Amino acid sequence: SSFESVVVIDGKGHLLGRLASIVAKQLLSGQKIVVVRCEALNISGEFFRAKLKYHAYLRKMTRYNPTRGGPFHFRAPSRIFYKAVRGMIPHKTARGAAALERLKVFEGVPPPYDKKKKMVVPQALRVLRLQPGRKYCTVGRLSHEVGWKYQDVVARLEERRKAKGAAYYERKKLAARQLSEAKKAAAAKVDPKVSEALAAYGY
């Protein structure tokens, strides 16, 4: 338990409801959250059942005027995740409104938030919660078929980003190699007793 300034959650491999509940507690506490890669969340069950649940959602609409009041059905993966979170917050009060202002959700990895450290919530990871043998789906596929347009744009944009992040990895490996080899050559030069003193204290 700690209080950071802003924490960045990587959405790939998490469960929709089991992540919204964790995140919705943090917002009301006073934390700031940023969810990235919502195109790659997960839902338990089988894909066809997710369709049926969503089609039953698309049927609700105000009768006398479909341009006011009626449930507006957003189609993007971030907006699906955002709807889940808004369910778990008293969003009709000033306290709830303020809490929602502390959240940001995107597709892909926008410019400000790449080159940062992405956390992981192990109380909602799929490979840890679900039982081997059952089936699951992906919000990305679900949203594409209910009428989301920008799958291929975000697909190829992500490909470019991960290509840039390969030369960077080689620099890190080079930097580590130099630090490790320097330690082996410098430890023996001049260190009569400091070494044993540190080793006894546990370092």
Partner: protein, 141 residues
């Protein structure tokens, strides 16, 4: 007929294995009661590694790479103790990677406030030497 398979390999639950409980205790398996529970005993002179006789659920143990060779199942505390000392289980486990890392854990927690000051200053002195060496190799490239 060359075959190259790259798969996983776990450690088995058998008679002779030594489990590591949560409170730094060791025990040796004597008979497998069920899928989730086994019967085990660890006789040891060191009062940190010794454990009573009883049932232990497998969801609260860790499989260590030590295994007593040819331990008859259902043995008694006396016979298991003889095999324990003859193989030297406690001696073998001392140098294992898990032990060393565990040993460091208590030492760090024991640093007194004055000791924290000294280690911090001592670290700086070693750091200074390391910083010089890195610059030399980095500039040379």
């Amino acid at each position: 007929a060359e075959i190259n398979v790259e798969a996983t390999s776990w450690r088995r639950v058998e008679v002779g294995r030594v489990l590591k409980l949560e409170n730094g205790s060791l025990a040796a398996i004597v008979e497998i009661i069920d899928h989730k529970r086994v019967l085990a005993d660890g006789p040891s002179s060191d009062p940190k590694l010794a454990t009573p006789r009883g049932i232990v659920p497998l969801s609260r143990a860790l499989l260590t790479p030590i295994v007593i060779p040819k331990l008859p199942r259902g043995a008694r505390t006396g016979a298991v103790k003889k095999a324990w000392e003859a193989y030297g289980v406690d001696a073998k486990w001392k140098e294992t990677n898990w032990a060393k890392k565990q040993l460091q854990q208590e030492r760090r927690q024991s640093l007194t406030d004055f000791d924290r000051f000294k280690v911090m200053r001592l670290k700086k002195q070693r750091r200074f030497e390391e910083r010089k060496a890195l610059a030399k190799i980095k500039a040379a490239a």
